[PDB]
Amino acid sequence: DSWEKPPLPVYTQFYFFNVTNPEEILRGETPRVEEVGPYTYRELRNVSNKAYVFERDQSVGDPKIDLIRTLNIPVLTVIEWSQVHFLREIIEAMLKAYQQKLFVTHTVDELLWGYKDEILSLIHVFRPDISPYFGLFYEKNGTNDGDYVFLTGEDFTKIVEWNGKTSHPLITKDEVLYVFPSDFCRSVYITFSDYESVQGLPAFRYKVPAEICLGSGVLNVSICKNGAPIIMSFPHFYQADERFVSAIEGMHPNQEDHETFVDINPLTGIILKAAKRFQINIYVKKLDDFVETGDIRTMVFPVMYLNESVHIDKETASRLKSMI
Amino acid sequence: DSWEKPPLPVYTQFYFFNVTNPEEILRGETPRVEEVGPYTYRELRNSNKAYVFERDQSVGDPKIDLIRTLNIPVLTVIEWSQVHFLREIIEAMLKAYQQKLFVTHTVDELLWGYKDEILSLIHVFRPDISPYFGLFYEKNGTNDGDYVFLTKIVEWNGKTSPLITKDEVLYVFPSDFCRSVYITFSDYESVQGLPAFRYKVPAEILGSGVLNVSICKNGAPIIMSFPHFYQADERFVSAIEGMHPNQEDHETFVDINPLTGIILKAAKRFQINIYVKKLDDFVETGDIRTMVFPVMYLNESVHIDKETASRLKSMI
Ligand SMILES: *[C@@H]1O[C@H](CO)[C@@H](O[C@@H]2O[C@H](CO)[C@@H](O[C@@H]3O[C@H](CO[C@H]4O[C@H](CO[C@H]5O[C@H](CO)[C@@H](O)[C@H](O)[C@@H]5O[C@@H]5O[C@H](COP(=O)(O)O)[C@@H](O)[C@H](O)[C@@H]5O)[C@@H](O)[C@H](O)[C@@H]4O)[C@@H](O)[C@H](O[C@H]4O[C@H](CO)[C@@H](O)[C@H](O)[C@@H]4O)[C@@H]3O)[C@H](O)[C@H]2NC(C)=O)[C@H](O)[C@H]1NC(C)=O
Ligand SMILES: *[C@@H]1O[C@H](CO)[C@@H](O[C@@H]2O[C@H](CO)[C@@H](O[C@@H]3O[C@H](CO[C@H]4O[C@H](CO)[C@@H](O)[C@H](O)[C@@H]4O)[C@@H](O)[C@H](O[C@H]4O[C@H](CO)[C@@H](O)[C@H](O)[C@@H]4O)[C@@H]3O)[C@H](O)[C@H]2NC(C)=O)[C@H](O)[C@H]1NC(C)=O
Ligand SMILES: *[C@@H]1O[C@H](CO)[C@@H](O[C@@H]2O[C@H](CO)[C@@H](O[C@@H]3O[C@H](CO[C@H]4O[C@H](CO)[C@@H](O)[C@H](O)[C@@H]4O)[C@@H](O)[C@H](O[C@H]4O[C@H](CO)[C@@H](O)[C@H](O)[C@@H]4O)[C@@H]3O)[C@H](O)[C@H]2NC(C)=O)[C@H](O)[C@H]1NC(C)=O
Ligand SMILES: *[C@@H]1O[C@H](CO)[C@@H](O[C@@H]2O[C@H](CO)[C@@H](O[C@@H]3O[C@H](CO[C@H]4O[C@H](CO)[C@@H](O)[C@H](O)[C@@H]4O)[C@@H](O)[C@H](O[C@H]4O[C@H](CO)[C@@H](O)[C@H](O)[C@@H]4O)[C@@H]3O)[C@H](O)[C@H]2NC(C)=O)[C@H](O)[C@H]1NC(C)=O
Ligand SMILES: CCCCCCCC/C=C\CCCCCCCC(=O)OC[C@H](COP(=O)(O)OCC[N+](C)(C)C)OC(=O)CCCCCCC/C=C\CCCCCCCC
Ligand SMILES: CCCCCCCC/C=C\CCCCCCCC(=O)OC[C@H](COP(=O)(O)OCC[N+](C)(C)C)OC(=O)CCCCCCC/C=C\CCCCCCCC
Ligand SMILES: *[C@@H]1O[C@H](CO)[C@@H](O[C@@H]2O[C@H](CO)[C@@H](O[C@@H]3O[C@H](CO)[C@@H](O)[C@H](O[C@H]4O[C@H](CO)[C@@H](O)[C@H](O)[C@@H]4O)[C@@H]3O)[C@H](O)[C@H]2NC(C)=O)[C@H](O)[C@H]1NC(C)=O
Ligand SMILES: *[C@@H]1O[C@H](CO)[C@@H](O[C@@H]2O[C@H](CO)[C@@H](O[C@@H]3O[C@H](CO)[C@@H](O)[C@H](O[C@H]4O[C@H](CO)[C@@H](O)[C@H](O)[C@@H]4O)[C@@H]3O)[C@H](O)[C@H]2NC(C)=O)[C@H](O)[C@H]1NC(C)=O
Ligand SMILES: *[C@@H]1O[C@H](CO)[C@@H](O[C@@H]2O[C@H](CO)[C@@H](O)[C@H](O)[C@H]2NC(C)=O)[C@H](O)[C@H]1NC(C)=O
Ligand SMILES: *[C@@H]1O[C@H](CO)[C@@H](O[C@@H]2O[C@H](CO)[C@@H](O)[C@H](O)[C@H]2NC(C)=O)[C@H](O)[C@H]1NC(C)=O
Ligand SMILES: CC(C)CCC[C@@H](C)[C@H]1CC[C@H]2[C@@H]3CC=C4C[C@@H](O)CC[C@]4(C)[C@H]3CC[C@]12C
Ligand SMILES: CC(C)CCC[C@@H](C)[C@H]1CC[C@H]2[C@@H]3CC=C4C[C@@H](O)CC[C@]4(C)[C@H]3CC[C@]12C
């Protein structure tokens, strides 16, 4: 019966890359992908937990019907496990007993929130700690998720958002912002881009700088993701080596749609407007046994990208300025 | 009100290596250890194990007796820092809260659990990470137990009431199913009158005779060995003063009745070690030598009694 509406409306939109030529990929050709999206989810805040409410009117189609053909992330994870000698004996045996495919078709809702994987369910009979369920956002609905932004510079360390924060120092263009995810695995630092105004209020625009085998502009986030072969990128390999783009037909990056930014009011430390824009990729290579990978090229294969956005409205901006 | 006595009495005895020269180790000298034990625990069952302490069959009280050995939680988190898992947080709190590489705790604290300062801190950020550490933490009362295969099954956590030949090999799984070990026929034995086959871990299984198990242990730097580096490279022994291996006390064996497949008598004898090396980013380590440092070894033993043996022979 709980879950309230946040002070500023936050929305996460998912965009999936549908694999149009799977048999052609296995025979060594360049992948051809087709971007399907958005699948708009409105955030809700009740500690502080968030819930995702689907908005069909603001989405491309129904995620409970719409199918996406992409890579089988569970088998590549359990293969990676096999290699580092974690459950090799079992994993090998069931991958031999139950032939799995590299390319798999599922509903958007199945990829996003969860599906029961054949091989994982088998592993679970032995290891009850290993979930049979897989999803890019599995069990993330209703949990105390939320990034952490910190201020730096010289000595100065101001916290702007600890899971979530709204309504002192001289914040300057010289200060850097350190951002951690819910899980604190790795950090990303965003530096001052320029001075902006947001619904009249002054703001400093922060952007991920150019300063951040394999190739530039991608982040191997494998340790944070239970050994799953996951690479991080900006949507469409924006700000990443040209090689990454040319590798996958369907990628067309541009700054206006694929950049990450966050406009913060200095005085208050309030985020007035922002866009969390990142892409999940899978590092795919040709492999000796179990799959069925064929003569696949070694590449950073895109699965899906998202946009987590917020924008202060005309009213709440003039109500915030009224509280001064 | 539950927990019954197993059909054959099983006992786990713990033996700890007490570090006599910690400051000397940090300055680069050879470690000097002193073996403290046994701490005898009688196993209880009702598929789930339960360890009951036997003071009368032990060296001292584990709730009083202290052991000075390595801070496994700091060594683990340092290893996480390196593989770039929570580098930023781990580094920051190791800087804010100066930790020692050598730490003193009660036997019961090392065995069943203690709250670690750094893990408690990490738990504030990562609720999925336990603040509690113990070599056997949360293992009391759980459905633990090995699996022994021939393709007939002798075990499956535990088994009693299979025609084995000297040619057959036995495959063993540890329940966590991480890795396997195979035991081959050593010789012919008699156990309480019953014929048996003595099965031993062969010579066929960093340096030889040690097993790296970091993946099975949440990235914690853990090496497995036989007690006192028995059947392992001499270099391993010479590295640590205090190690004196011998077959009679440190070998692992298992006497199986050829007809029924029943284990009549056996010794599960293994040692937990930590791979410790000197690191420049962690002042904690000093100028420590790169070595496979022993923490503790155990003996999980079973032996059929005069009565149950003559009751088993009666069923023939
Ligand atoms: C028991 O078993 C365990 C577990 O099974 C064994 O664990 C091993 O523990 C070590 C701990 O030090 C760990 O190594 C560390 O991790 C990285 C791997 O280093 C090795 O591999 C390097 C090859 O990768 C590089 O290759 C190209 C250059 O030739 C190029 O593509 C890259 O530079 C690439 O480096 C990468 O860097 C990224 C970080 O960037 P992003 O995430 O994209 O932002 C890493 O994520 C990625 O993993 C990769 O390494 C090779 O060059 C190197 O020489 C090693 O052979 C290194 O980053 C670490 O580097 C550090 O090495 C020194 C010593 O540790 C440090 O003092 C120094 O500061 C430096 O930073 C480091 O080597 C193993 O990965 C880990 N293995 C597993 C399976 O987890 C353990 O060894 C066993 N113990 C015993 C007792 O035997
Ligand atoms: C992402 O890319 C993937 C891969 O191309 C797309 O997935 C395909 O999506 C279509 C629907 O758009 C799926 O097609 C459906 O197949 C069903 C199963 O086939 C049966 O029927 C044939 C005979 O016709 C038998 O030979 C076969 O064995 C099965 O018994 C059909 O039931 C569906 O039929 C209906 O089609 C349309 C609606 O799509 C109706 O108008 C018709 O009247 C008819 O009732 C349908 O053809 C197909 O299965 C998917 N492929 C895979 C690999 O699963 C994604 O849709 C695409 N997503 C986006 C949004 O681009
Ligand atoms: C969350 O993040 C995503 C960013 O990835 C946003 O979605 C994008 O939204 C922008 C607008 O907010 C869209 O941009 C506009 O696209 C129009 C059509 O583009 C399609 O068609 C062209 C061919 O005609 C293709 O080349 C292209 O690939 C698209 O498929 C354009 O007509 C628009 O042009 C107008 O604006 C520009 C501004 O730079 C002017 O210069 C022009 O003159 C013109 O007036 C514009 O480019 C974008 O297409 C959306 N992408 C996706 C994938 O959905 C979300 O909106 C963002 N934020 C929120 C809150 O939702
Ligand atoms: C679980 O596993 C451990 C093995 O680590 C067992 O504990 C050992 O038990 C054996 C006996 O079962 C002990 O061996 C005996 O030790 C006596 C004293 O040894 C100490 O002192 C000598 C010097 O006097 C040192 O060299 C040595 O390192 C010890 O510190 C000896 O007097 C015994 O000798 C007798 O038996 C041998 C058998 O080979 C005969 O040849 C001799 O003639 C003589 O009669 C014997 O060696 C051993 O010390 C114990 N070790 C520890 C660390 O406790 C558990 O018993 C085992 N099983 C069960 C079910 O618990
Ligand atoms: C060799 C070592 C092996 C170790 C094995 C140990 C046991 C493993 C058990 C199960 C896993 C099996 C399947 C493998 C899963 C692979 C990981 C995965 O799935 O990778 C996909 C996504 C990608 O991440 P991303 O791009 O979204 O994030 C970006 C975040 N950055 C910044 C860190 C990059 O990972 C996600 O999203 C995560 C989705 C799952 C989240 C679960 C936790 C939910 C939150 C709180 C706890 C409560 C849950 C329990 C139930 C409570 C109610 C009863
Ligand atoms: C880079 C990747 C990082 C991933 C991080 C993921 C989250 C990690 C979370 C917490 C761990 C933090 C502390 C680090 C612990 C290091 C591991 C450890 O501690 O290493 C010590 C001992 C050594 O093992 P060993 O020599 O004895 O075995 C020999 C077995 N071989 C044959 C496989 C070699 O490890 C043991 O013993 C294990 C002791 C703990 C056992 C807990 C499970 C108990 C059983 C069943 C589940 C029920 C528990 C929950 C409560 C239920 C009631 C409410
Ligand atoms: C992204 O980061 C991940 C994790 O940080 C990183 O993972 C590395 O993957 C390889 C997978 O093969 C691991 O290397 C193996 O380690 C085991 C255990 O020690 C060995 O048995 C393996 O040996 C075989 O395979 C080798 C393949 O090169 C052969 O050379 C060898 O002869 C054997 O046949 C192998 O050495 C490696 O340990 C992990 N690292 C970690 C930290 O887990 C991955 O490389 C990064 N991905 C990208 C896209 O850069
Ligand atoms: C393993 O090695 C460690 C490290 O050497 C060793 O720990 C030490 O144990 C002694 C006790 O044996 C501890 O000393 C005690 O310290 C407290 C606190 O100050 C005092 O109250 C005690 O005083 C009594 O000391 C004698 C008895 O020990 C009495 O005769 C006397 O009258 C005093 O009342 C006592 O000094 C010491 O704290 C630890 N060291 C560390 C680092 O904690 C451990 O006991 C060894 N274990 C075995 C079984 O070998
Ligand atoms: C995420 O969790 C929220 C909260 O549980 C879900 O939203 C509610 O779901 C119930 C299901 O009975 C329905 O009444 C409504 O659809 C939602 N209620 C409100 C008040 O919004 C949400 O659907 C979950 N998201 C996903 C993807 O499963
Ligand atoms: C392991 O668990 C068992 C079972 O809970 C413990 O043994 C019992 O503990 C209760 C505690 O109130 C006492 O009645 C007795 O000491 C035990 N009862 C029986 C019937 O044996 C055991 O102590 C635990 N071991 C450790 C090391 O904590
Ligand atoms: C892995 C790399 C390439 C991605 C970089 C992380 C970027 C996209 C993150 C780090 C911190 C993030 C911000 C942190 C806080 C919030 C408040 C929330 O209510 C909406 C999203 C918003 C406004 C985020 C927008 C995007 C942001 C700036
Ligand atoms: C890590 C390596 C070096 C250790 C090798 C594993 C050895 C020690 C294992 C494999 C199978 C095991 C046996 C399997 C079954 C039982 C029955 C149980 O009621 C007591 C322990 C006992 C009798 C085990 C003793 C030790 C044993 C022989």
Author numbering:
A (entry chain B): 51 to 96, 112 to 220, 225 to 236, 257 to 301, 318 to 429
B (entry chain A): 51 to 96, 113 to 216, 226 to 236, 258 to 301, 319 to 429
Manuscript excerpt for this entry:
LIMP-2 is a type III transmembrane glycoprotein encoded by the SCARB2 gene primarily found in lysosomes and late endosomes. LIMP-2 is a receptor for the trafficking of glucocerebrosidase (GCase) from the endoplasmic reticulum to lysosomes, where the acidic environment activates the sphingolipid processing capability of GCase7. LIMP-2 belongs to the class B scavenger receptor family that also includes CD36 and SR-B1. Taken together, these results establish LIMP-2 as a lipid receptor.
We determined a lipid-bound structure of the LIMP-2 luminal domain expressed in HEK cells at 3.0 Å resolution. First, LIMP-2 in our structure forms a symmetric dimer (root-mean-square deviation 0.98 Å for all Cα atoms in the dimer after applying twofold symmetry) via contacts in its two highly distinctive regions of the protein, the α-helical bundle and the region that forms the hydrophobic tunnel. Second, clear electron densities for one phosphatidylcholine (PC) molecule and one CLR molecule were present at the hydrophobic tunnel within each monomer. CLR is completely, and PC partially, buried inside the hydrophobic tunnel. Near the PC head group, D272 and helix α-9 (residues 270–274) are flipped out of the channel to anchor and accommodate the quaternary amine of PC, while K330 and K205 are shifted to contact the phosphodiester of PC. To accommodate CLR, the long loop connecting β9 and β10 (9–10, residues 232–265) flips away and is entirely displaced by the α-helical bundle of the opposite subunit. The displacements/disorder of 9–10, α1, α10, and α11 make the CLR site a much less restricted channel with large openings that connects the distal and the proximal faces of the dimer. In addition to these protein–protein interactions, the acyl chains of the PC molecules bound at both the hydrophobic tunnel and the clefts also contribute extensively to the stabilization of LIMP-2 dimer, explaining the requirement of lipid binding to support dimerization. The expansive mannose-6 glycan, P-Man9GlcNAc2 at N325, makes intermolecular contacts in the dimer.
